[PDB]
Design a protein around this ligand. Structure first.
Ligand SMILES: Nc1ncnc2c1ncn2[C@@H]1O[C@H](COP(=O)(O)OP(=O)(O)OP(O)(O)=S)[C@@H](O)[C@H]1O
Ligand SMILES: Nc1ncnc2c1ncn2[C@@H]1O[C@H](COP(=O)(O)OP(=O)(O)OP(O)(O)=S)[C@@H](O)[C@H]1O
Ligand SMILES: [Mg+2]
Ligand SMILES: [Mg+2]
Lengths: 298, 436, 287, 319, 277
DNA sequence: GCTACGGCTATACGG
DNA sequence: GATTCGTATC
């Protein structure tokens, strides 16, 4: 066909696909197929967007005979691939071999699974592409207000605690002090009241926290970055943080947050680059930020 | 700095705004259920809001409980979310813990805030637990008092499958027929507070607030306010609230009180005989439709009109008017429940009964429609015909339709089986009984 | 005004299972702070069962009380906090260890309104993550029970291991009556359920009885200074609090019971090195 | 684009002295705001007469700097179920915020008519137990949609339709703050098309000044039409059939009004029609309903409306 | 009407495990089951009267004792019994023998509604613990018994396929083949195919189309054969094949499907037939 | 160190 | 709102 990709590491593809389940599990997933690899871009209510990245080195075979077009966009229902790739790859003597292919427009997306003596085949008929631009839910490369690198385990524990305490709303703090002290907390408004989860300033958890002046170059100390995010969208990164070693956090002055999941099988492939862009709430209230500041003071 | 209905609450039983006969009946009942082996186990109190249904119990307890208690009340709190307690077992746990309130810890259990009986799954649990209490084999149980406020549930859902609980919040839509007719359940229904106790207990509050009412020169138009409030409402709480809102005011704001919901038979009487206040039938119909749409826009109302239009003159009116009523009621049935159908079928009847309205007419007593009995007899006939068809196809070999059964084999076959078999297990009598 | 810390795993465990039980007895947990101990208690809505836990000053590594800086003079400060909100704070997260559980309240003029009438709980994990919570509290008036000296009257002392196993075997969904039948010879505990009959003998509620007889050899100390009936869920929960703290130095694992007649309430009290536990439960007066 | 707010939100009153209309009620609200003791109140009335901006301003003035942590506004856009009443409202009522003496926490339950029944029955206990600290301010469009036990504990404040002078005063204030050229007939046309709705007066004025600039009768009536109930009333109260068919066709059919809309408005106009005998009114109701059924079944044509008007004239002349 | 039987699981493991294979299937299919105790053979029936029917033949030599007398023809009495209680009793005996024991089951018909006195013994470690159970059953009438008859299956020129035994090299592969379609949550119809030897599991829907294949060797003892079946019946087929070495699959063209299971006790052979419409 | 199983939790269903 | 019975009071 016009594109073909096979692999045996079904656990990796299953983990990548399970990170798209937090975004519904009963809608459409849009797939890019280019020479670099194949990705799953998923958006909910135009307020949050998640994008996978399965490199070509991840699969043992990646041909991509589509010389005419640089990339191929197809839209299919997400639940079926989630149910299909969950083979768990048991009976290690006979490894279940994956086979992904797509002949082009009108052709269905094929998922052939080979169990040596068994060759099953699933065909997913593609849907018409909705008129939405994935470039809208993207962050600046020149207006970064703050950039933080946080380890996966501490962040995952923080989101788990926030989910357990309800957390109908969430806030983000990012203040850098001139004495090399860096503070980063996830303040939340829940049934309990006002709760704060301060990340430690050690380099084992907060590798690097840099607060900018909206230019992504200046390092201003003593200033605070406030992001008011709905925890409904912020909880979508919890499952993505369960497989990550380090998480990159970047926000700009236009109220978009980019959660960059860095996941660390072949040797050449880097990993699954999972990017979860998120929009900030308007925060019509003005005393709420003052209360956030006062709580962070004492 | 407090609401006047909380700072002027009755301290004794003689300050409670309740009729003397009602108070005496409640006294006798409550003193009956505090005896060792009481015939009545649960006391149900129905009525509108603010009829002192809980203002008489909480002051009868202070004089009755510390008389039989070997040496106040235990209200159930709905908003109590215990950890490890599903929201359907809260009342069950309350009942289990309230059965130990016997001598040396005696207390009368009052259930004013009922559980969420608007959900179909916990209303059944409520009824089952109350039935277990009423059929309890425990020889010794504390008295139980349940106060249910009769209020009309406003129209919020969009479905014609609305049940009884989605129309009226009464003791019939929460308690089944078995609990209400249980021998050990005494039901003392309440009435709205009359214009005499309401006129006295408000003048009490006025003469206590003498200073404030005199400073704002609100002591020459006092009785014109208490009389208007008493004539408007039968509520002991809303009257005091309106009195406080008027006395604390410093202007000419027209006072207002909560509106009352016209009942089913009340609305039927309003349609048939007319209202005593408004002589304009258009205004009365418009206000009835804008205040009681949940009752007018039904089928039971149009059935009650047909069942009770003969009570205007005890049947002593012209047949040409009866025809003009029934033909409009039949034309309304073909309008498929449009809002223009009820507004025509309630206006034509009112106009017909107004054009023949003369004094000296001795009217009759209205009654509920009898279609509910007709449907039950029809269901009995359905079951009997099903049994006839079943016995006619296993003891024999013959298939016959239901319509043929009701027309010919519901009468002729019983006679044949009475002569062919009985004269010289089976069905021998007429299906669903004779035609009387 | 008050600051207490917990820096032991078993102490945190018993504190969580101590509060979890007080939250499942009543929606809101009332805590009184004294100069010598911390008292957390919960009363039923029917006022039929009460459980009171008393974490001594030695139970906390740091214990500071400054009542001079609501307050009831008998200087005792009592406040009411939501049980569900408190039990979701003291829970042990999976994968991380609480290196310090700090409970404090500073009600001064200088403290901000963001902390005024707001209980301060600071949790430090083994991953150095600082999680601070501010649940609201309502100052109330503490009312002590004399039952402790009223009938501190036959006394029963039995090890809680076998009784805990028996109570965990029983379920509160269908059974909520406990018969503690004790004589001088043996001791038998049966979790039974009465069967009410409908209109025509119809089984409205079925009867289930699981009986467990305990020989006096397993019994530690009994003195008839007797059939008593009470509930099951409160007794079950109160039984599961002492085992939570795995202590081998004291080696108690036992319960102390006191009751006089079917009318008077029964007192069950468990003992821990830094924790005092008691359960008040009313009894069926049907003689 | 621009950040310029619409004048409905740009000129929303922020004080109780700027809310026009119902003077006898606004003055009482100001008296409550000064004294402090605010009873439980239910404010009801027609849309757009100032029922929300009154409660919000009253709460703002009553609580001062404690507005952020002293009010709890729960609208229909929030899940006002029984769980929220049992948890969030209960915890807000149980809060022990210290206030100046006489002041109380306010639970602004706007659009309380859409609240379910179980939520209101739990609200009964919520205002029963916690009444010394928090106060409930229900805002609705129909008072009968709140259960009677909840209405018993409240004080009913019935807002009325705004007159032609209060709306004129507020419009003149807006025109003075926006430097808008106007003429008296244009303002009168705006008042006439508003039908006692300040929001629909501000919107029409903004549309007129945006489209044409000068507020005259022509520039107003060429962008916002005359109220269609007043045209249906003119059609239903004519003398001849050839004079009612003209008002039907040239003023409701070539203008763009659906037949079902015409019938639905005709029923409402007939219900409130005056100087008409009751037999004539009920016959007109029956004839309107018979055409409503036909339109709902599919035949929504102008011929059916003409037949309905002809039958109305038949019942008018002799029947 | 006197019915009494004795079963020993440890004495004979095959006939006993087939009894476990019959009881689990009639528990998984639907509540209640039909037990006809013919004087020479037992047959356990689950008749829903589209839903499938199972007809398992149990001989008389499987039990140590098969004393059966009745006034009907060939000493046939037919029971209707709730399967949950007997399944629980049977699981109790499974745990009894798992803990270490060799006791037998004494099952007696003790008294139209009757019950079976299923009593057995268990020894913990030299203690005597008697387990007594009574499962309420109803007596089916002879006129009601003759209303139930085994569905008929013909193959004028149709196709039965010999499924490879699960103990062989390809047995696990074929089991994985059958269970592959069971992994999908949103599947309700499977389209079996027959070519003469290949069989394929095809699930075609509005927007997705499964087409699983078996590339291993197959045998057909001695034309297209397709049928539409439900997923639950395929699960029952999986469970039946998992406990059987000899499994026979026959496919009819748009008429029915039959899952035939047989155990070679040689002696009369115990067979399980799952009629599927 | 790995697996089974109990407890916790998210989600579809029912009246 | 209608009738019928029963009080309490002026
Ligand atoms: N003289 C009086 N008689 C009766 N109630 C009084 C009087 N003065 C003040 N009240 C108050 O009026 C209220 C009446 O409440 P009740 O009628 O007892 O309760 P209720 O009958 O359940 O009404 P609902 O249905 O709960 S609104 C109470 O809050 C009383 O304190
Ligand atoms: N009396 C008034 N004085 C000044 N502006 C008013 C007045 N009434 C309404 N408005 C305007 O109406 C808008 C606000 O409408 P609201 O007061 O929120 O409506 P409402 O009367 O509560 O009706 P609903 O119930 O929300 S449809 C703003 O543009 C106000 O300036
Ligand atoms: Mg009350
Ligand atoms: Mg509004």
């Amino acid at each position: 066909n016009k594109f073909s990709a096979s692999t045996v590491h079904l656990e990796h593809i299953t983990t990548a696909l399970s990170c798209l389940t937090p975004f519904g599990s009963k809608d459409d997933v849009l797939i890019f197929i280019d020479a670099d690899g194949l990705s799953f871009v998923r958006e909910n209510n135009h307020v949050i967007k998640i994008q996978l990245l399965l490199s070509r080195e991840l699969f043992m075979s990646y041909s991509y005979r589509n010389e005419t077009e640089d990339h191929m966009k197809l839209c299919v229902k997400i639940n079926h691939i989630l149910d299909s790739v969950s083979v768990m790859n048991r009976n290690s003597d006979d490894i279940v071999e994956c086979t992904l292919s797509y002949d082009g427009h009108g052709s269905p997306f094929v998922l052939i699974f080979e169990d040596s003596f068994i060759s099953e085949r699933v065909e997913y008929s593609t849907y018409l592409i909705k008129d939405f631009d994935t470039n809208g839910l993207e962050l600046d490369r020149e207006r970064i207000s703050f950039e933080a690198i946080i380890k996966g385990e501490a962040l995952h524990s923080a989101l788990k605690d926030l989910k357990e305490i309800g957390c109908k709303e969430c806030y983000v703090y990012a203040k850098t002090e001139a004495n090399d002290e860096n503070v980063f907390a996830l303040i939340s408004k829940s049934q309990l009241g006002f709760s704060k989860i301060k990340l430690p300033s050690n380099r084992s958890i907060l590798e690097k926290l840099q607060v900018f002046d909206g230019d992504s170059t200046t390092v201003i100390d003593g200033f605070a970055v406030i992001g008011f995010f709905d925890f409904t969208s912020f909880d979508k990164i919890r499952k993505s943080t369960k497989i990550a070693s380090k998480v990159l956090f970047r926000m700009d002055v236009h109220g978009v947050l980019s959660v960059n999941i860095l996941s660390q099988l072949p040797k050449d492939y880097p990993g699954i680059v999972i990017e979860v862009c998120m929009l900030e709430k308007e925060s019509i209230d003005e005393a709420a930020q003052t209360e956030i500041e006062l709580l962070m003071e004492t | 700095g407090e609401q006047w209905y909380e700072k002027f609450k009755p301290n004794c039983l003689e300050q409670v705004a309740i009729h003397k006969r009602k108070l005496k009946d409640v006294q006798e009942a409550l003193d009956a259920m505090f005896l060792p082996n009481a015939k009545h186990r649960i006391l149900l109190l129905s009525g509108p809001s603010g009829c002192s249904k809980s203002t008489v119990i909480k002051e009868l307890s202070k004089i009755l409980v510390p008389k039989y208690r070997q040496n106040k009340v235990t209200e159930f709190r709905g908003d109590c979310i215990v950890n490890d307690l599903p929201q359907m077992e809260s009342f069950s746990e309350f009942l289990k813990g309230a059965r130990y309130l016997v001598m040396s810890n005696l207390s009368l259990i009052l259930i004013e805030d009922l559980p969420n009986v608007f959900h179909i799954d916990t209303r059944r649990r409520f009824q089952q637990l109350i039935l277990q209490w009423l059929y309890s084999s425990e020889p010794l149980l504390p008295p139980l008092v349940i106060c249910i406020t009769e209020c009309e549930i406003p129209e919020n859902d969009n479905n014609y499958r609305k049940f009884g609980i989605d129309y009226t919040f009464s003791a019939e839509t929460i308690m089944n027929k078995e609990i209400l007719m249980h021998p050990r359940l005494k039901r003392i229904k309440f009435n709205p507070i009359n214009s005499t106790l309401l006129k006295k207990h408000l003048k009490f509050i006025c003469v206590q607030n003498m200073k404030m009412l005199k400073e704002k020169n609100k002591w020459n138009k006092r009785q014109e306010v208490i009389d208007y409030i008493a004539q408007e409402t039968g509520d002991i709480r809303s009257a005091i609230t309106t009195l406080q809102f008027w006395a604390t005011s410093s202007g000419s704001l027209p006072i207002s009180t909560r509106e009352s919901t016209i009942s089913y038979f009340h609305a039927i009487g309003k349609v048939i005989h007319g209202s005593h206040s408004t002589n304009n039938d258009n205004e009365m119909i418009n206000n009835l439709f804008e205040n009681s749409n949940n009752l007018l826009s039904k089928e039971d109302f149009k059935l009650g009109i047909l069942e009770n239009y003969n009570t205007f003159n005890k049947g002593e009116f012209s047949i040409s008017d009866a025809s003009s009523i029934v033909d409009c009621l039949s034309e309304c049935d073909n309008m498929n429940g449009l809002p223009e159908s009820n507004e025509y079928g309630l206006r034509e009847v009112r106009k017909t009964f107004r054009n023949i309205s003369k004094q000296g007419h001795n009217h009759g007593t209205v009654y509920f429609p009898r279609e509910w009995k007709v449907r039950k007899l029809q269901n009995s006939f359905k079951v009997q015909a099903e049994d006839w068809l079943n016995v006619s196809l296993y003891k024999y070999n013959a298939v016959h339709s239901f319509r043929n059964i009701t027309l010919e084999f519901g009468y002729y076959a019983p006679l044949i089986r009475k002569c062919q078999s009985y004269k010289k297990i089976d069905v021998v009598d007429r299906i669903g009984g004779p035609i009387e | 005004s008050f600051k207490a810390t917990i820096t032991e795993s078993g102490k945190q465990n018993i504190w969580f299972r101590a509060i979890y039980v007080l939250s499942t007895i009543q929606d809101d947990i009332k805590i009184t702070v004294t100069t010598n101990e911390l008292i957390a208690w919960s009363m039923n809505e029917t006022d039929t069962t009460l459980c009171q836990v008393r974490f001594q000053k030695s139970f906390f590594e740091e214990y500071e009380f400054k009542p001079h800086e609501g307050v009831q003079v008998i200087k005792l400060y009592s406040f009411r906090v939501n049980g569900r909100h408190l039990t979701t704070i003291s829970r042990k997260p999976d994968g991380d260890g609480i290196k310090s559980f700090t409970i404090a309240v500073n009600n001064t003029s200088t403290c901000p309104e963001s902390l005024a009438n707001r209980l301060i709980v600071v949790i430090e994990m083994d991953s150095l993550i600082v999680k601070e919570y501010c649940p609201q509290f309502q100052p109330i008036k503490y009312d002590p029970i004399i039952i402790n000296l009223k009938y501190k009257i036959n006394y029963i002392c039995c090890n809680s291991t076998l009784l805990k196993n028996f109570l965990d075997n029983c379920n509160v969904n269908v059974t909520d009556e406990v018969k503690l039948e004790i004589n001088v010879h043996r001791l038998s505990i049966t979790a039974f359920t009465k069967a009410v009959y409908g209109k025509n003998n119809d089984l409205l509620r079925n009867a289930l009885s699981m009986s467990n007889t305990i020989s006096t050899l397993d019994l530690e100390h009994y003195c008839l200074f007797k059939s008593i009936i009470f509930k099951l869920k409160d007794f079950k929960n109160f039984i599961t609090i002492g085992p939570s703290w795995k202590t081998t130095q004291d080696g108690n694992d036992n319960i102390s019971l006191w009751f006089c007649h079917p009318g008077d309430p029964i007192l069950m009290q468990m003992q821990k090195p830094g924790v005092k536990l008691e359960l008040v439960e009313v009894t069926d007066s049907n003689i | 684009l621009s950040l310029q707010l619409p004048w409905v939100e740009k000129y929303r009153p922020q004080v109780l002295s700027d809310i026009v209309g119902n003077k006898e009620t606004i003055d009482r609200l100001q008296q409550i705001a000064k004294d402090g003791n605010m009873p439980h109140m239910i404010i009801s009335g027609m849309p757009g007469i100032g029922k929300t901006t009154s409660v919000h301003c009253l709460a703002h003035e009553l609580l001062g700097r404690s507005y952020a942590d002293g009010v709890l506004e729960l609208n229909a856009s929030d899940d006002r179920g029984i769980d929220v009443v049992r948890n969030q409202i209960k915890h807000f009522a149980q809060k022990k915020l210290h206030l100046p003496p006489g002041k109380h926490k306010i639970v602004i339950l706007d659009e309380a008519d859409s609240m379910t029944a179980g939520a209101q029955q739990a609200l009964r206990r919520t205002m029963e137990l916690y009444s010394n600290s928090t106060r409930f301010a229900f805002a609705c469009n129909q008072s009968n949609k709140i259960i009677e036990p909840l209405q018993s504990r409240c004080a009913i404040l019935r807002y009325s339709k705004l007159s032609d002078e209060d709306v004129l005063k507020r419009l003149l204030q807006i025109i003075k703050l926006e430097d808008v050229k106007y003429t008296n007939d244009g303002l009168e046309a705006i008042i006439f098309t508003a039908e006692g709705d300040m929001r629909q007066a501000i919107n029409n004025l903004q549309s007129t000044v945006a489209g044409h600039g000068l507020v005259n009768a022509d520039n107003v009536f060429k962008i916002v039409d005359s109220p269609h109930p007043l045209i249906v009333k003119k059609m239903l109260l004519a003398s001849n059939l050839e004079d009612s068919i003209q008002i039907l066709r040239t003023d409701l059919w070539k203008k763009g009004y659906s037949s079902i809309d015409i019938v639905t408005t005709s029923f409402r106009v007939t219900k409130n029609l005056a100087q008409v005998k009751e037999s004539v009114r009920l016959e007109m109701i029956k004839e309107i309903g018979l055409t409503h059924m036909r339109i709902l079944e599919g035949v929504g044509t102008y011929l059916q409306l003409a037949s309905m008007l002809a039958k109305i004239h038949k019942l008018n002349n002799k029947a | 009407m006197k019915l009494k039987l004795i079963v020993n699981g440890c004495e004979a493991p095959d006939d006993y495990k087939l009894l476990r294979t019959t009881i689990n299937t009639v528990a998984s299919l639907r509540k209640t089951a039909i037990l006809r105790f013919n004087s020479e053979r037992l047959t356990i029936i689950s008749t829903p009267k589209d839903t499938g029917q199972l007809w398992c033949t149990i001989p008389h030599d499987v039990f140590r004792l098969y004393t059966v007398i009745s006034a009907r023809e060939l000493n046939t009495i037919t029971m209707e019994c709730n399967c949950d209680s007997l399944l629980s009793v049977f699981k109790r005996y499974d745990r009894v023998m798992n803990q270490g024991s060799s006791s037998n089951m004494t099952i007696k018909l003790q008294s139209p509604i009757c019950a079976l006195g299923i009593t057995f013994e268990e020894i913990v470690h030299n203690k005597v613990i008697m387990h007594s159970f009574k499962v309420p059953v109803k007596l089916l009438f002879r006129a009601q018994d003759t209303r139930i008859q085994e569905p008929m299956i013909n193959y004028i020129q149709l196709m039965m396929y010999k499924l490879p035994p699960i103990s062989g090299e390809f047995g696990s592969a074929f089991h994985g083949f059958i269970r592959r379609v069971e992994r999908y949550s949103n599947v309700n119809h499977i389209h079996l195919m027959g070519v003469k030897v290949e069989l394929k599991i095809i699930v075609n829907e509005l927007d997705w189309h499964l087409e699983i294949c078996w590339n291993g060797p197959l045998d057909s003892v001695i034309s297209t054969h397709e049928v539409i079946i439900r997923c639950k019946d395929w699960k029952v087929c999986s469970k039946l094949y998992a406990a059987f070495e000899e499994v026979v699959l026959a496919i009819s063209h748009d008429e029915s499907c039959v899952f035939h299971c047989s155990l070679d006790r040689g002696r009369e052979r115990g067979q399980i037939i799952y009629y599927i419409a």
